[PDB]
Design a protein around this ligand. Structure first.
Ligand SMILES: Cc1csc(NC[C@H]2CCCO2)n1
Length: 284
């Protein structure tokens, strides 16, 4: 048997290396990553890789690794795929811990926009989880945490993290991580996977896919959203993505909404993440 070396960026930025038989399916590598992370609730998570267009793809667990990475390196990231709308109901603390790590990266990267105070508050729960109770000895008036809290840091933000940290005295890691999630889960973009598209008029939009349904971000004004129950069929042809919206009451005929994606692979990818998030909603 011929093994291939796999490299996986873990959610704390560390690198895990293992080997799998060259014909192995994605689930094989994923199972090894989950065993290493001591993770049981693994179906909220996935592996990503970068294709030749350099686009983030989900590694399909059903399909051979080699038929997905193709010409690329066997380099992956471990990630949350299905953001739980109710993290309090996850059976395990370790699940909630990896979820926090993903959300920390969603925030720092700017994928999850956050008000100043909420950046400070989430920061404060992360420090309490990582360092324990506020300690003046460690932090002077010129203190700057090693922790990344935000896409841009200011001394004011570092100050607010410390002030809020002071109030979490006696909070255990699992409790800090639960408070982190009870706040993060209310952010408008929590678990929203954004794809660039154009509408039927050629105007550039973002299509958001999440637990609750589909979002169309035209501009700040009039945001369209479709709960999963209102979506009958989703399809792609060529560069185009179509959503079939279930007929409202006493309206004879459904409405089809079509979008232009940058290319056929962008369309296929959006279809697959939509189908998967629709099946996830169904499982709630
Ligand atoms: C019971 C079970 C475990 S994984 C799964 N389905 C695979 C993807 C689609 C929905 C979320 O996860 N069902």
């Amino acid at each position: 048997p011929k093994s291939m070396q796999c490299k996986v960026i873990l959610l704390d930025g560390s690198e895990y290396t293992c080997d799998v038989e060259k014909r192995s399916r994605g689930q094989v590598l994923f199972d090894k990553v989950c065993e290493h992370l001591n993770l049981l609730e693994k179906d909220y998570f996935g592996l990503t890789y970068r294709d030749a267009e350099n686009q983030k793809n989900w590694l399909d667990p059903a399909k051979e690794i080699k038929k997905q990475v193709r010409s690329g390196a066997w380099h992956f990231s471990f990630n949350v795929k299905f953001y739980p709308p109710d993290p309090a109901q996850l059976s395990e603390d370790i699940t909630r811990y990896y979820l926090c790590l993903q959300l920390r990266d969603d925030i720092v990267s700017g994928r999850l926009p956050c008000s100043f105070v909420t950046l400070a508050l989430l920061g404060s729960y992360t420090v309490q989880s990582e360092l324990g109770d506020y300690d003046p000895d460690e932090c002077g008036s010129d203190y700057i945490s090693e922790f990344r809290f935000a896409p841009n840091h200011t001394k004011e933000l570092e100050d607010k993290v410390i002030e809020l940290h002071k109030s979490h005295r006696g909070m255990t890691p699992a409790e800090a991580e639960m408070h982190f999630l009870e706040n993060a889960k209310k952010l408008s973009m929590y678990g929203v996977d954004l794809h660039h598209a154009k509408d039927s008029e050629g105007v550039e939009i973002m299509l958001g896919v999440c637990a609750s349904g589909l979002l169309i971000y035209r501009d700040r004004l009039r945001i369209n959203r479709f709960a999963w129950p209102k979506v009958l069929k989703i399809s792609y042809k060529r560069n185009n993505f179509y959503i079939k919206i279930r007929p409202g009451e006493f309206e004879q005929f459904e409405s089809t909404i079509g979008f232009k994606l940058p290319n056929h692979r962008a369309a296929k990818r959006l279809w697959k993440v939509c189908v998967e998030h629709h099946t996830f909603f169904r499982l709630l």
